[PDB]
Design a protein around this ligand. Structure first.
Ligand SMILES: CC(=O)c1sc(CCOP(=O)(O)OP(=O)(O)O)c(C)[n+]1Cc1cnc(C)nc1N
Ligand SMILES: CC(=O)c1sc(CCOP(=O)(O)OP(=O)(O)O)c(C)[n+]1Cc1cnc(C)nc1N
Ligand SMILES: CC(=O)c1sc(CCOP(=O)(O)OP(=O)(O)O)c(C)[n+]1Cc1cnc(C)nc1N
Ligand SMILES: [Ca+2]
Ligand SMILES: [Ca+2]
Ligand SMILES: [Ca+2]
Ligand SMILES: [Ca+2]
Ligand SMILES: [Ca+2]
Ligand SMILES: [Ca+2]
Ligand SMILES: [Ca+2]
Ligand SMILES: [Mg+2]
Ligand SMILES: [Mg+2]
Ligand SMILES: [Mg+2]
Ligand code: NA
Ligand code: NA
Lengths: 267, 566, 567
């Protein structure tokens, strides 16, 4: 946990040779916690340079590493809901050294985007589309005899939308081989206010999903082990993960609303 | 200036600096003229209301420079003690309220968080500014706020161990904060201690030291503070001021002009000081100790006649008591003069070093009870409660000047720890016996034999209780001792009266009345008991008479309570 | 050495040095053999009795040199804290009594004036040595005596403000005294603070500074001490020792060998607090944890490792700890001050003036409440109910077991203002602990048994013992939970329906929680008989915690006898 945004590029020896998921998967499990620390450092630095969304990405640093570590991306399809938390994802998918162009003319887009990288399976921005999209990919892949995984990472805020409910119900019906990961930090931009937030797995099992959790979203050993088990399970699977928005930056942990996004630092 | 203005002076610039933000709109060229206006407005207002005087004159320039350079109130300013914060109050939207200073429902004697958003920390006791500023700075850094944290501490306040603890910890956590030493080579009396000698000469404990600079050179102050505002880590600025600057009589007599009054019977402190001299003249073992309060506790004559047996330890209540313990180990007879409110800072030394060892140390506890305008930070509300639970303590509560002399003697001669509590101001002016003889320990005096209801008085409310007893024909006991309690007398009165009433100028919770209640309970005595004393809240500043009336400790309040219980 | 001897070692020279006078008859060439023999005996005897370990090994040579050079007991030697003073006791006519160390009617845990003329000042709390030595020096000069005054103070004890106050005053009076800094770069935990980083300031304060010297080179110690003994004015000797010197396992683990148990249940309340602190910190980013150099004792170990940016060891600086919390609370953070009842005595003014008077949101977790056992009266938490409940604004709580501690810590934390939760050393009845973090209603007791003629109002951990008594007598039992605000409604009801109210607390009866009940009964004109059980008005001699509680009547047997005697 830090208190100041680094003003100069931190030394990140492990991250620098984890430039893509294939390279990340060659590192040993004992090195992933150190990678999480370096990634978080770099994220704080680069977002301090460019502006950008902030707290949500800090909360999924560990989740992002485990996902690209356990799943065979980009052949396995990973879908990020909204996409404002996908800076760690971009850093690990051949764009770390391009984050300096983030949200600038002709630079990296604010959200995942199919045209920007083969690692972005679905252009997002509006919320709650990830389950629908991942289900479409899972159905298509099964019909064309290609054995691949389909994973949707959706926040507790994005899950309040009606279309996420429609997608959960259709996926159960068709018995699709897909994994929905609920990234639950008890936040939207404001605090998440609503009946679903109050409930947050009987609801998901009654809807036809194999529910697991809640697990600690910042315990990499648990994340990797859990994701490995569910990767080997089929049908509608639902993983409930708990994260802290702004994790690892004390000012953001203390003011999650105000650190949802930040402006570029000025000297 | 040589005379205090008796008419509201003309201060045009000051009227345009009613807040720091307005002050920061003025130009540097105006500031020297603003310091003169403020200085003479300060002189005018304190003369109209009385209060602390010389220390605030010495920080007129430092106070303007601080609010001009720092982004108050967002930037945090902490004034140590606060007796020098009248200029601060004048520049933080309270200038036109200074006419109510230290009066009932008016401005408080010291900075108070509930009084103004520009007061970051309520002060009164000394040496808390660095600790409080450090806690603020640690919080702001974790929160990601860019606000600065500044503590202004005088050379006297810096003599307390708690300041040393704060300076060391701040270095350890590499806190971004500024400590400003306001060094005028004075406390109330002249400063003492090795620290004062070093400061006359010219930081290795992890602080970036800057100075000394002239604390009345506004151009220098503004430029220095600007440079240090943005420096990172523990910063230490050494400023030199003159107590009473700008008022010649105060510059010459900085002790007498520490505080002034606005526009019979000896003070209890003066009765103590005379007893101290008289006993010292008969007993070479007596040693007198004060923590920087020679004038208030009144060790003036004693310090002059017996300089070899007088010890000013600076503002170091803790060391005063353990020092006395060591003296007592060699068969000397130390007397610790200490206000009830400041003794709570030496509580551990009293318990662990004196009481646990049953060492022969006398505590002369002045300012017991309500102290008036200085308000609740200085109230001596708890010393009966926090001392009487300590094994070995002899706890006494004299009711007038003669009783103070006698109980001082009794506790002094007692072979063990003893405490004698008495209030600010003067008493009923009863004759004082010049002899130096003790009274029997644990025995009260029946001052009036009546019936139906008995008033058990611990301390100076005896005169008020005697008035009430005239109308009700009550029995009145001058209890003298909280511990050991006159159990035989209490037992007799419990069997012969229908109501016992305890009266003390101390918290009812845990106080002398409760010692009577504990005794009645232990013996199964079922007489009704009415406990009169200080309530369980902090009494707002006012005249002592007004605070006692609010608490029901005058004749009217006592009579009302007794009659309603009956 | 590598193992603690189990049989008494052969110490022919130590046996000839049973007092300093005897020691001083030996020759210098003998002192290094004596040091070896003393270290062996020390290992042996502390292995037999348990007690403080590492610090004494560090001063074996210093202790020998001091009594060899100075004319003790005429010359005054003051040990700071005194946990390092076993070699001192071994050389001052108490070697053959060390088998009674820290046992009922045996030698005390620390130096004690009543125990021996060689103990000039009873210690236990830290940082008193310089103040006491200066008082003796001042007195001796005024009396026309020519005695020396010496204070041995560790680098940890030197972090306290009162040691700074003493150094400052000694210079002012130009006293003839010697302060020896025993610097091993350690406290209990590692010495953290701006002064440990520094370890001249001592020179600039008026002291003649000599050192640093090897605190384990007896030849240099004797020669240096001899030189400074007859030097005048304030003298300051910087000595460097190693905690655990001469016993490799202790040198390698100075924390674990600070103290040992004699050689051969549920969680400790401190551990319950430590878990609560971590759990609440996981849920609230504002929580900050403060200890004055007692991370291990109060058990902030896990918290310090998991939340290093929100953990603060202020060294042995109880005063600063509390005012620091006050400042944090002014900015909206939520400080928790972990502090022993006996040590909170030293920060009373900061609690009253900086926290209570301002009604700032600070939680005090008060460990070692009540009788603490072998450490004796200097460390007893006998008074915190009395000295806190008289302070306006204080919420004062007394949990009866592990689950209650967790609940009341949560209650005090969520309360917006000053709160105190007191609990004893050791472990409890081992009742189930609710994992939730939920408060209880403020100012309400819990009826644990409904009976007939006697109502036992229990404030704290004597509840289990009171339940045994209440089952024998068929009595009512109340788990009071709060001293302030008191559950007045419940007290009033029981006072009308029972013939005898009995209050029980592990605090001084004088001013205690039972007296809060007495104050209420009196104010309302309720005249039910009241029996107050608690700690007596004297200092209870060291023994096992159960033996001290039995002496005070706070076990089932003592409680029942008291009740039935009243009836
Ligand atoms: C910035 C933006 O577009 C975001 S992020 C967000 C909620 C994020 O909560 P979630 O729990 O899903 O993720 P978290 O940040 O990790 O907590 C909203 C409502 N919006 C605005 C918004 C509103 N409405 C819709 C349909 N889409 C979006 N993206
Ligand atoms: C009025 C009051 O409470 C003052 S002002 C003062 C002198 C402080 O000197 P300093 O150099 O810090 O300030 P200066 O006046 O500008 O020279 C003392 C000892 N006191 C009494 C006092 C005693 N002891 C303690 C712990 N606190 C206080 N406030
Ligand atoms: C057990 C006990 O009372 C000790 S020993 C010790 C630190 C000892 O460090 P020092 O450097 O002075 O000596 P060393 O062990 O030889 O290194 C502390 C903080 N305590 C607890 C403690 C806490 N706070 C206070 C005021 N006094 C004491 N005694
Ligand atoms: Ca005056
Ligand atoms: Ca008289
Ligand atoms: Ca006479
Ligand atoms: Ca009067
Ligand atoms: Ca709180
Ligand atoms: Ca117990
Ligand atoms: Ca029954
Ligand atoms: Mg969310
Ligand atoms: Mg001064
Ligand atoms: Mg040490
Ligand atoms: Na923002
Ligand atoms: Na141990």
């Amino acid at each position: 946990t830090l208190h100041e945004i680094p003003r100069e590029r931190p030394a990140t020896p492990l991250l620098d040779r984890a430039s893509s998921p294939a390279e990340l998967r060659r590192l040993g499990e004992a090195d992933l916690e150190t990678l999480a620390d370096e990634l978080r450092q770099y994220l704080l630095y680069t977002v301090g340079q460019t502006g950008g969304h902030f707290g949500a990405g800090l909360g999924v640093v560990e989740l992002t590493i485990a996902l690209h570590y356990v799943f065979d991306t980009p052949d396995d399809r990973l879908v990020w809901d909204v996409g404002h938390q996908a800076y760690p994802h971009k850093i690990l998918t051949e764009r770390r050294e391009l984050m300096g162009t983030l949200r600038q003319k002709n630079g990296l887009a604010a959200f995942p985007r199919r045209a920007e990288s083969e690692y972005d399976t679905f252009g997002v921005g509006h919320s709650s589309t990830s389950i629908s999209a991942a289900l479409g990919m899972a159905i298509a892949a099964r019909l064309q005899g290609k054995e691949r995984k389909s994973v949707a990472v959706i926040g507790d805020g994005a899950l309040t939308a009606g279309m996420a409910f429609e997608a959960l119900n259709h996926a159960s019906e068709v018995d699709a081989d897909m994994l929905v990961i609920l990234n639950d930090n008890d936040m939207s931009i404001s605090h998440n206010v609503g009946g679903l937030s109050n409930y947050l797995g009987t609801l998901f099992e009654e809807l036809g999903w194999n529910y697991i959790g809640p697990i600690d979203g910042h315990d990499l050993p648990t994340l990797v082990a859990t994701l490995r088990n569910m990767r080997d399970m089929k049908g509608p699977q639902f993983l409930h993960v708990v994260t802290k928005k702004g994790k690892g930056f004390a000012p953001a942990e203390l003011d999650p609303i105000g650190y949802h996004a930040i402006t570029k630092l000025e000297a | 200036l040589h005379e205090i203005p008796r008419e509201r002076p003309a201060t045009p610039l000051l009227d345009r600096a009613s807040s720091p933000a307005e002050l920061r709109r003025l130009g540097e060229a105006d500031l020297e003229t603003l310091a003169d206006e403020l200085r003479q407005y300060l002189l005018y207002t304190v003369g109209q209301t009385g209060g602390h005087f010389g220390a605030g004159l010495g920080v007129v320039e430092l106070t303007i420079a601080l609010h001009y350079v720092f982004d108050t109130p967002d930037d945090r300013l902490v004034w140590d003690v606060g007796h020098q914060a009248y200029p601060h109050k004048i520049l933080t939207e309270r200038r036109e309220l200074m006419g109510t200073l230290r009066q009932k429902n008016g401005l408080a004697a010291f900075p108070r968080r509930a009084e103004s958003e520009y007061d970051t920390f309520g002060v009164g006791h000394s040496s808390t500014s660095i600790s409080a500023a450090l806690g603020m700075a640690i919080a702001a850094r974790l929160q990601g706020k860019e606000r600065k944290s500044v503590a202004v501490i005088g050379d006297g306040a810096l003599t307390a161990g708690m300041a040393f603890e704060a300076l060391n910890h701040a270095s350890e956590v590499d806190a971004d904060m500024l400590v400003i030493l306001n060094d005028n080579d004075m406390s109330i009396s002249h400063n003492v201690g090795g620290l004062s000698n070093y400061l006359a000469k010219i930081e290795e404990l992890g602080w970036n030291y800057i100075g000394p600079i002239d604390g009345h050179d506004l151009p220098t102050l503004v430029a220095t503070l600007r440079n240090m505002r943005d420096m990172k880590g523990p910063q230490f600025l050494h400023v030199v001021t003159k107590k009473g600057k700008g008022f010649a009589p105060a510059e010459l007599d900085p002790i007498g002009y520490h505080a002034i009054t606005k526009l019979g019977g000896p003070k209890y402190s003066s009765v103590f000081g005379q007893w101290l001299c008289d006993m010292a003249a008969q007993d070479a073992r007596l040693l007198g100790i004060t923590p920087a309060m020679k004038e208030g506790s009144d060790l003036v004559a004693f310090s002059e006649r017996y300089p070899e047996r007088y010890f000013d330890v600076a503002i170091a209540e803790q060391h005063a008591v353990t020092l006395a313990a060591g003296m007592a180990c060699e068969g000397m007879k130390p007397v610790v003069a200490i206000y009830s409110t400041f003794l709570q800072r030496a509580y551990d030394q009293l318990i662990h070093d004196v009481a646990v060892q049953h060492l022969d140390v006398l505590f002369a506890i002045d300012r017991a009870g309500l102290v008036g305008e200085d308000g609740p930070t200085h109230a001596g509300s708890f010393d009966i409660s926090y001392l009487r639970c300590i094994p070995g303590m002899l706890v006494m509560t004299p009711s007038d000047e003669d009783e103070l002399r006698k109980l001082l003697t009794t506790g002094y001669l007692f072979d063990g720890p003893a405490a004698v509590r008495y209030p600010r101001g003067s008493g009923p002016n009863h004759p004082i016996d010049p002899d130096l003889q003790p009274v029997e320990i644990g025995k009260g005096v029946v001052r009036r034999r009546g019936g139906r209801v008995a008033l058990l008085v611990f301390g100076v409310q005896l005169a008020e209780a005697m008035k009430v007893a005239e109308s009700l024909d009550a029995t009145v006991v001058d209890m003298r001792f909280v511990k050991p309690l006159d159990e035989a007398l209490v037992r007799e009165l419990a069997g012969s009266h229908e109501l016992l009433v305890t009266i003390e100028e101390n918290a009812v919770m845990g106080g002398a009345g409760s010692a009577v209640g504990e005794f009645l309970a232990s013996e199964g005595l079922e007489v009704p008991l009415l406990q009169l004393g200080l309530p369980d809240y902090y009494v707002e500043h006012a005249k002592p008479s007004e605070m006692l009336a609010e608490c029901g400790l005058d004749a009217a309040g006592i009579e009302k309570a007794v009659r309603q219980r009956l």
